[PDB]
Amino acid sequence: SEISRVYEAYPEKKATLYFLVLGFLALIVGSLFGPFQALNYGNVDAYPLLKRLLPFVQSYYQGLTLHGVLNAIVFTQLFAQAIMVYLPARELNMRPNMGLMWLSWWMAFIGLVVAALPLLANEATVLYTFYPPLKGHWAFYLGASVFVLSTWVSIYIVLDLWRRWKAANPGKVTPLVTYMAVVFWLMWFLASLGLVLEAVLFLLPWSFGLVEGVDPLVARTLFWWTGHPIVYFWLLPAYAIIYTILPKQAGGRLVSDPMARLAFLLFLLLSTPVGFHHQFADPGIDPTWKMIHSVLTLFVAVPSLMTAFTVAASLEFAGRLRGGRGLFGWIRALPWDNPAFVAPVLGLLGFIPGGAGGIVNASFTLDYVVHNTAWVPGHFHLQVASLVTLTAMGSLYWLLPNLTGKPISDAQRRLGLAVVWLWFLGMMIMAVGLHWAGLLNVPRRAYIAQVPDAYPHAAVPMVFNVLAGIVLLVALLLFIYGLFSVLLSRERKPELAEAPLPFAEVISGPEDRRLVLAMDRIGFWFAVAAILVVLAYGPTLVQLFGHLNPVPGWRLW
Amino acid sequence: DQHKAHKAILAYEKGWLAFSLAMLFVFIALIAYTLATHTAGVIPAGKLERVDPTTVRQEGPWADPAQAVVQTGPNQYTVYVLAFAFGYQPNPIEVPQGAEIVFKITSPDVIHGFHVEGTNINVEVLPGEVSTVRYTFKRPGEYRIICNQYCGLGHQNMFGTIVVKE
Amino acid sequence: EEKPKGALAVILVLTLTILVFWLGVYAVFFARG
Numbered sequence A: 001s002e003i004s005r006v007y008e009a010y011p012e013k014k015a016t017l018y019f020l021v022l023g024f025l026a027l028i029v030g031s032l033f034g035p036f037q038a039l040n041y042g043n044v045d046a047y048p049l050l051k052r053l054l055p056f057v058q059s060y061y062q063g064l065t066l067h068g069v070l071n072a073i074v075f076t077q078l079f080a081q082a083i084m085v086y087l088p089a090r091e092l093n094m095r096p097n098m099g100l101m102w103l104s105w106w107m108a109f110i111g112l113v114v115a116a117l118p119l120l121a122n123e124a125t126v127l128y129t130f131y132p133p134l135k136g137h138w139a140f141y142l143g144a145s146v147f148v149l150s151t152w153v154s155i156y157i158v159l160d161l162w163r164r165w166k167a168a169n170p171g172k173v174t175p176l177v178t179y180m181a182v183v184f185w186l187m188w189f190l191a192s193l194g195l196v197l198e199a200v201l202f203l204l205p206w207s208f209g210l211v212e213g214v215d216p217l218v219a220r221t222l223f224w225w226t227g228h229p230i231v232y233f234w235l236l237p238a239y240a241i242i243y244t245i246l247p248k249q250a251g252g253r254l255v256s257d258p259m260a261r262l263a264f265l266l267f268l269l270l271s272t273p274v275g276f277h278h279q280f281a282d283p284g285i286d287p288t289w290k291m292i293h294s295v296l297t298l299f300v301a302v303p304s305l306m307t308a309f310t311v312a313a314s315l316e317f318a319g320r321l322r323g324g325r326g327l328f329g330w331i332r333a334l335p336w337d338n339p340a341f342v343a344p345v346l347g348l349l350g351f352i353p354g355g356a357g358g359i360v361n362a363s364f365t366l367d368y369v370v371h372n373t374a375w376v377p378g379h380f381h382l383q384v385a386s387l388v389t390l391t392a393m394g395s396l397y398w399l400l401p402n403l404t405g406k407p408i409s410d411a412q413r414r415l416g417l418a419v420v421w422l423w424f425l426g427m428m429i430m431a432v433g434l435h436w437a438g439l440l441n442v443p444r445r446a447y448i449a450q451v452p453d454a455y456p457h458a459a460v461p462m463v464f465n466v467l468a469g470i471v472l473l474v475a476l477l478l479f480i481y482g483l484f485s486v487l488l489s490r491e492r493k494p495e496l497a498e499a500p501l502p503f504a505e506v507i508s509g510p511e512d513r514r515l516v517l518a519m520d521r522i523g524f525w526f527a528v529a530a531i532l533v534v535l536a537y538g539p540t541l542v543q544l545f546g547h548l549n550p551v552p553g554w555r556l557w
Numbered sequence B: 001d002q003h004k005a006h007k008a009i010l011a012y013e014k015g016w017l018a019f020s021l022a023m024l025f026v027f028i029a030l031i032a033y034t035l036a037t038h039t040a041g042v043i044p045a046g047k048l049e050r051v052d053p054t055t056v057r058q059e060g061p062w063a064d065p066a067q068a069v070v071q072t073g074p075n076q077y078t079v080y081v082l083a084f085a086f087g088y089q090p091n092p093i094e095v096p097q098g099a100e101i102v103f104k105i106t107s108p109d110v111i112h113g114f115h116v117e118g119t120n121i122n123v124e125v126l127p128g129e130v131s132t133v134r135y136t137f138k139r140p141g142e143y144r145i146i147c148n149q150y151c152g153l154g155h156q157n158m159f160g161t162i163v164v165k166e
Numbered sequence C: 001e002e003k004p005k006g007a008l009a010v011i012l013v014l015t016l017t018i019l020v021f022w023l024g025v026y027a028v029f030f031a032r033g
Ligand code: HAS
Pocket: A231, A232, A234, A235, A277, A278, A297, A298, A300, A301, A302, A304, A305, A307, A308, A309, A311, A312, A315, A331, A345, A348, A349, A351, A352, A354, A355, A356, A357, A358, A359, A360, A361, A362, A363, A367, A370, A371, A372, A376, A379, A380, A381, A383, A384, A388, C010, C014
């Protein structure tokens, strides 16, 4: 049936390509807004312009709803699927149950579109959090709840591939990438309950017309069950890429199979029971529970630091492999002329200030110093907007050959770089603006350009914000010409397209064996996963159902 | 190189794990520290305190805003506040410097936030609910209140005022 | 081959940025308490 027959041999390339293009359009649409939001914090109202340009945007708030929902819910969802299915698949040279996989992609696209409609329409400006009582169009919630259920498909699909690879290999340790994605999708499952409880139990009845109110203290404690771990579900696909592909683009080998399983293991143990850190300023939630999740959230920062060493040491060892030699010898030896590489490694750099952001945030009482301020977007752009995202960008310059057969012309490649550096220096500039302004009490989710005399002392950050606005505008634009020219390109020389993903080899130890074996107790720890959820969101959910107090929704835009 | 390198690394990561743990605990120590002196005043009242947003503004201590400061100790004042679509009540909130002010805050509409610019008063205001926090206003003068939670379209406008008296 | 100085520098800078931020904020917390 095919003249790129691909898809009767490796058809999973078909599903993956599609997914990922979705993501990126989501990202290209959502992000359109961001530079505007940027000049806003710049104290410059670009919404006259934007408004004209695309004329259907009613308010800053709809803008920030699209940018929010499409960039951080939708774009990171379609990357995670694409990656944490297409890789475990290939490391096992196995075909994902492709019946389901296109169910997966369909749910997504339906869900998205079902949902996208009220949003362009202005009928669900309630932010990517859709904190009730602000009350969204029913086609928003069913829209979103499907598109997220779209990942329960993918949970099964992957567990499929695990189930059967083990039928083919009795007494044989789960290979790394496949192992990562199992403990991943389990993790996501525990974590996905919260929003899914909130959508079924409350959001849908209430928005369908089938009740007058949701109690908004539950509404948001269910929301945060999920709504924390989700950032871990954005982040881990980029760790997969970083841990087991990056060091080979780097010139090198990953220095520990065990270590990377260890960290992943920990994101199944401590990613889900921690979302009262998001509620340090909530009422009716007991200070000791808040202090426990405060403790738990500190533990969860641990895997990520261990990641710091494993990943930095790999890139270091490569550095010395390509004849690096000072204390920073190893750095300039790395292949700075590769977008596959430059992207996540720049992303990793602004992860260092980004993490130090999270750890503050997570320290309970210290949160009262920055909660709901520009500070927050500061932290969270460093994390997902740069790290997860740039990883995604760089991985065009390998995933795209792998999946299209289309190659990267040396002048498309020189573009990537420009973008990846233009993007990164943007975030960094914008980081400083937000964090700073954040600390001068500048709130967040606010059209502050509309009350231009209101943040007297934010004068100087506001400049960084302006400038970053211009930079990432330029940056984003370059990225559109680039993306639609690595795709609007008939020249496919797919000798490089069958070509298998540049996985990185391990430096094994003797320890490897006894320890990798204990972390492969997968079923067991996934129970400790739900034990930890039960005990944590446990006597709090007890309570707030013992005392529901639903309240009429409002629409206020 | 190669498997001489693997030992070094595994032992180093141990050193790392160890120092991260210490440093993190110093933090959990330090956090806790704050949690036992006064400045944990701003932490919300954890006890559920149900109200009714529809009649909050017609009956109760939020129904009459001349009646929102309410002396309650030799040195204590309860302040009943109302955070509603696109201002705060009372405006202004006149409390004495030196005093332990006990803010009690709730909403007739949607969640807003109550960030008393210049303090760690930073509480989320939830319809259906009273958020309670303590503060002791030490130096007198003027404190602006910013709503720091999107509550719809007059959001960027939603401020108020505290006048701690000299 | 030897001691992985590169990575240590990386967790040093890390570890200090972590301190810079945490100590710094703590401070302010008080400043405004
Ligand atoms: C994808 C995303 C995210 C990850 C990353 C993320 C990580 C953390 N966060 Fe966060 N966050 C919070 C605490 C943390 C903590 C402790 C971590 C941890 O996971 C951080 C651990 C990470 C590190 C400690 C960094 C390690 C550094 C590494 C691993 C880089 C090493 C560099 C190398 C190896 C490069 C070497 C190479 C060379 C070339 C030299 C808290 C508080 O507890 C709030 C609520 C605050 C409030 O008041 O609203 C919060 C709010 C958010 C929300 C805002 C949600 C909302 O809209 O309300 C999103 C946007 C977000 C996303 C993400 N966040 N975070």
